[PDB]
């Protein structure tokens, strides 16, 4: 699969489990259309979001529901959600891993694009 | 100034100068309404976006135009922009500094909130 999302918790030093993730694709009319979604696994990963056939060039948004994650742990967070917005280009490199490292008032996100 | 934005460039070890920033506020009908915009100075800072009177409670989105930054520097980055989405002023007025540390395939953002 061409798109994987990984979410980690910097407060507890753990995968961020059962985090809701929504992927959207930008439509011609510039609105965001649901594309795929899921919850992270026990390893903080969400696999299986799409297939090579379905994941065509375009602008995509990954929304990670960090607020709900923190609230279920009893912790007061700053953000409503985390967002990752990027163009998929299949000129060269074919697999995208979108990683997010969560803290209450900060987050870091990285993209690893390989093979 | 209740809202300040600070942007740094992790490739150069410097302020990220001339970075466009657009702030949106969610309206009663749930769409993102333009609220304020500006660009970072030579110190990577953006002051003057709003006033304590205008910066009412709401859900705000700070969009940092990182792709246009990397490309005005001749570089092809991953993200379209860096987004910071948060509820503001729901326990009374606060001052928010939204900071972002930029790399071509990653960024970190953090919020300092003071009363
Ligand atoms: C194996 C493996 C562990 C981790 I932990 C990881 O995830 C991240 C997430 C972020 I955000 C980083 O900056 C880094 I380095 C690794 C990945 I992919 C794979
Ligand atoms: C003085 C001062 C230096 C920096 I440099 C800074 O900006 C950041 C931005 C991020 I993103 C950080 O993680 C940190 I720590 C400081 C700020 I506010 C103030």
Swiss-Prot record, chains A, B:
The chain holds residues 30 to 144 of 147 of the full protein. It comes from Homo sapiens. Glycans are attached at residue 89. Changing residue 80 to Q: In AMYLD1; amyloid polyneuropathy and cardiomyopathy. This is Transthyretin. The modification Sulfocysteine is found at residue 1. Changing residue 33 to G: In AMYLD1; amyloid polyneuropathy. Each monomer has two 4-stranded beta sheets and the shape of a prolate ellipsoid. Antiparallel beta-sheet interactions link monomers into dimers. A short loop from each monomer forms the main dimer-dimer interaction. These two pairs of loops separate the opposed, convex beta-sheets of the dimers to form an internal channel. GO terms for cellular component: azurophil granule lumen; extracellular exosome; extracellular region; extracellular space; protein-containing complex. Changing residue 9 to G: In AMYLD1; leptomeningeal amyloidosis; leads to unfolding and exposure of N-89 to glycosylation by STT3B and subsequent degradation by the ERAD pathway.
């Amino acid at each position: 699969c061409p798109l994987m999302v990984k979410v980690l918790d910097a407060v507890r030093g753990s995968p961020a489990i059962n985090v809701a993730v929504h992927v959207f694709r930008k439509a011609a009319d510039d609105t965001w259309e649901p594309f795929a979604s899921g919850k992270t696994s026990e390893s903080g990963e969400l696999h299986g979001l799409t297939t090579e056939e379905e994941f065509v060039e375009g602008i995509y948004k990954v929304e990670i529901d960090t607020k709900s994650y923190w609230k279920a742990l009893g912790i007061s967070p700053f953000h409503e959600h985390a967002e990752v917005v990027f163009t998929a280009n299949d000129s060269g490199p074919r697999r995208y891993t979108i990683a997010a490292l969560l803290s209450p008032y900060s987050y870091s996100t990285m993209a690893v694009v390989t093979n």
